[PDB]
Design a protein around this ligand. Structure first.
Ligand SMILES: [Zn+2]
Length: 46
């Protein structure tokens, strides 16, 4: 079967956007908040 028990590292979470492995579920969540990018329909540039 496929359960893991292979990856030595301790990053149970990986950003499926860029490719960054995080050890803490949060370390990633907070990182993702940045990916969302700052945009606002209009002349607003970031
Ligand atoms: Zn990312």
């Amino acid at each position: 079967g496929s359960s893991g028990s292979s990856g030595t590292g301790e990053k149970p979470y990986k950003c499926s956007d860029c490719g960054k492995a995080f050890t803490r579920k949060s370390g990633l969540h907070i990182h993702q908040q940045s990916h969302t990018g700052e945009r606002h329909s209009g002349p607003s540039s970031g």
